[PDB]
Design a protein around this nucleic acid. Structure first.
Ligand SMILES: [Zn+2]
Lengths: 100, 97, 48, 407, 49
DNA sequence: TTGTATTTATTGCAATTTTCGTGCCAATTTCTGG
DNA sequence: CCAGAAATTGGCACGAAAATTGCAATAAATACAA
């Protein structure tokens, strides 16, 4: 499957997702520092085999958290500034998000 | 005894001179751990090294610490064991250097 | 401070423990050079 | 007629069902044995993994030699998600010293479990959650209830009972919900903080795109296999030399000429099959997989006047790239169920509909299979309850009683 | 590990110069072995050598 | 002009095995009314 | 609140249908020597 740009990252806390909009992209005018998330992205890692351990994990914590990684864009260390512009380029035939 | 095994791999070689000469074919064969027969490097389907290729695990060693290629032996309790299916020794992955 | 892999980790542990001593060892680039010279069909080795 | 079926036609047919990588391997193998065939600094950076971080913390911890060996054994048996993959008896065996009991291994494991991240090297989920909960201060409002639930009743929490849990734990809805939320605020996989790896891609065999208001399908020229005749060896074919030398070249020239034609025919057959598939499943490439049509091998086998065996062989392990994504060219063949009035509905479309309907349900009361069947039997589809259950199981979705939540 | 492959974005596992030279040597050696096995005419095996 | 050796063209049948949807029914899960 | 029922779920089965896999040495077009 494809990589998804979204704000619903399971492993990160609620504070680190405060600067992202509904599309998983940082707001315009946000003051960011090194390590902050700018674009939220997840990479699939799903597989058919499911041990009882995976069943317990999915039952307790939900299915969204599993079968997904975290490959978000972060501010490089020692870099700060203000978000003044965001540009989104989408391939033809792909559904556009709200930000675009 | 795991203590001696872990202590032995940090030992430094003692020497006082460097010798250079020509290499006999027998010398070159004694250096090697196997013969490379195919020009393949990576499988690109399982993303594992091809057998008898330029990156073969049976010749140059494991790609992960103390694991054989097929996956029968995986931990330190099987260290030094040559797998009978894939032929990969269960040892450290730095032997590929 | 360089390609000697084991001494790198020994020195950090010694410094954190307050012991300012090192065990030098052998650089890795010399081993790389030995392997590259051997790949040319030349028998170069350390003795004693 | 039954064709002729020479040992050459068998190899020509067998080329159809090989993927591009296996086909390249076969081409190389045939290339190194036929002289007249031919084909047309960086070092990197070291990355720190979870085990490297754990060993770095082990080196800077006041362990003894025996404790350090035990810690090395423990860190060796830790997977990418941070869980211990072997029992402590295996670690004790791997130590190799007979004067060590299980208590020392337990103490070293307890010390390691407090490394960064906390909860790493845990035996199971209950142990990891208890380790993470033991680092919270006592001032947490609902620490004791969450600890009780995790320690004693976790299987029926996974079963989503939420009612027997009330009876056994003797709590209220406004407190049990807070305890459950506190539990769900914990980190299930401690070892995923350090993520190392790379996604793995594929090279598509055929590309379908939209040009000036229609769909165009063409082979991917960056991976299409092609061979060539060696002219230098072909020149010295009938010249003045030994008769055996001249006979060795004619046979190999014939073999090379046949192999090139077999490759070209394989490419042409693949292109025609892909073109027919794209023409048949035209609504899918525009409106998603809720509109996929139920076609089989015999449907394509009449539009190209081939046999079903050829269509089966061609579509094996060959990937198609579309604006929607990468598929396997056999993802477009599916079963069907009867609809209302007349027609057929594909199983892929029904799976998409089931996923959409389940994703838009009331969390308090999830939709059972009978309710899902009733909802589907309003759009025209006639699918049985057992079939809907099978589709839900194939989608890896828990039953209704395991999808409800206390909210 | 002294001649590693370069992984880049998009999954391109490009090869280095030493791996290319080794591949050329191995291909020529395999073709020559097969030709010597099959008793090819001398005019071809000389070119391969 | 004609029988003959060479080079193309051949990419399907027929078994055998797998998968399909949907019914039967025992074992769990929730609901209800007394 | 306690039975008893009503509902839910998944293993096994069935006959059709679909998909897979093993075959092993032919027929005609064409250049050619009598
Ligand atoms: Zn093995």
């Amino acid at each position: 499957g494809p990589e998804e740009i979204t704000a619903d990252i399971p492993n990160v806390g609620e504070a680190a997702l405060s600067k992202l909009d509904e599309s998983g992209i940082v707001y315009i005018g946000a003051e960011v520092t090194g390590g902050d998330i700018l674009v939220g992205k997840v990479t699939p890692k799903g597989e058919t085999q499911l041990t009882p351990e995976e069943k317990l994990l999915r039952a307790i914590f939900g299915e969204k958290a599993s079968d997904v990684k975290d490959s978000s864009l972060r501010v490089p260390n020692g870099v700060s500034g203000t978000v003044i512009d965001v540009q989104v380029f989408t391939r033809d035939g792909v559904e556009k998000d709200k930000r675009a | 005894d795991l203590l001696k095994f872990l202590k032995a791999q940090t030992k430094t070689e003692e020497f006082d001179a460097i010798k250079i000469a020509l290499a006999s074919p027998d010398m070159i064969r004694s250096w090697s751990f196997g013969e490379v027969k195919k020009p393949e490097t990576i499988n690109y389907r399982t993303f594992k090294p091809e057998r008898d290729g330029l990156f073969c695990a049976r010749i140059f060693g494991p790609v992960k610490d103390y694991e054989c290629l097929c996956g029968k032996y995986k931990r330190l309790k099987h260290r030094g064991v040559i797998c009978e299916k894939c032929g990969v020794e269960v040892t450290q992955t730095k032997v590929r250097r | 401070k360089s390609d000697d892999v084991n001494g790198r980790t020994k020195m950090y542990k010694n410094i954190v423990d307050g012991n300012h001593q090192m065990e030098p060892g052998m650089p890795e680039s010399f081993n790389v050079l030995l392997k590259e010279i051997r790949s040319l069909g030349i028998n170069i080795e350390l003795e004693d | 007629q039954q064709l002729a079926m020479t040992p050459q036609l068998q190899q020509a047919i067998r080329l159809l069902q090989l993927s591009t990588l296996e086909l390249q391997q076969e081409l190389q193998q045939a290339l190194e044995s036929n002289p007249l065939l031919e084909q047309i600094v960086y070092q990197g950076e070291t990355t720190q993994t979870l085990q490297d971080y754990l060993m770095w913390q082990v080196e800077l911890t006041p362990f003894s030699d025996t404790d350090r060996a035990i810690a090395t054994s423990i860190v060796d048996a830790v997977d990418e998600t941070g869980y211990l993959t072997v029992p402590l008896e295996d670690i004790l065996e791997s130590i190799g010293d007979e004067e060590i009991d299980i208590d020392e291994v337990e103490a070293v494991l307890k010390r390691i479990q407090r490394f960064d991240p906390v909860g790493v090297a845990a035996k199971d989920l209950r142990d990891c959650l208890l380790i993470q909960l033991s680092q919270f201060d006592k001032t947490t409002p609902w620490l004791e209830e969450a600890r009780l639930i995790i320690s004693d009743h976790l299987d029926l929490l996974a079963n989503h009972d939420f009612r027997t849990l009330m009876r056994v734990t003797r709590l209220k809805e406004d407190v049990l919900k807070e305890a459950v939320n506190l539990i769900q605020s914990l980190d299930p996989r401690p070892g995923q903080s350090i993520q190392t790896g790379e996604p793995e891609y594929v090279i598509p065999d055929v590309l379908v795109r939209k040009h000036n208001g229609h769909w165009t399908v063409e082979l991917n020229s960056d991976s299409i296999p092609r061979l060539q005749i060696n002219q230098h060896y072909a020149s010295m074919c009938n010249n003045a030399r030994n008769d055996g030398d001249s006979q060795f070249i004619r046979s190999n020239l014939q073999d090379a000429k046949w192999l090139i034609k077999s490759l070209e025919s394989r490419n042409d057959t693949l292109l025609r099959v892909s073109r027919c598939i794209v023409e048949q499943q035209q609504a899918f490439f525009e409106q998603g997989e809720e509109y996929m049509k139920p076609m089989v091998l015999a449907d394509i086998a009449q539009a190209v006047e081939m046999h079903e065996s050829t269509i089966s062989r061609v579509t094996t392990q060959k990937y198609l790239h579309s604006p929607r994504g990468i598929f396997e060219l056999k993802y477009f063949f599916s079963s069907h169920v009867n609809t209302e009035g007349g027609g057929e509905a594909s199983s892929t479309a029904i799976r998409a509909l089931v996923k959409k309907l389940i994703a838009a349900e009331n969390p308090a009361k999830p939709l059972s299979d009978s309710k899902l069947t009733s909802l589907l039997s309003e759009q025209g589809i006639m699918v049985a309850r057992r079939t809907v259950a099978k589709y839900r199981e194939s989608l890896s979705i828990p039953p209704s009683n395991q999808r409800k939540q206390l909210v | 590990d002294l001649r590693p492959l370069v992984p880049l974005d998009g999954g391109r596992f490009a090869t280095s110069d030493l791996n290319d030279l080794y591949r050329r040597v191995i291909n020529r050696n395999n073709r020559l072995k097969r030709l010597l096995d099959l008793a090819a005419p001398d005019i071809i095996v000389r070119n391969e050598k």
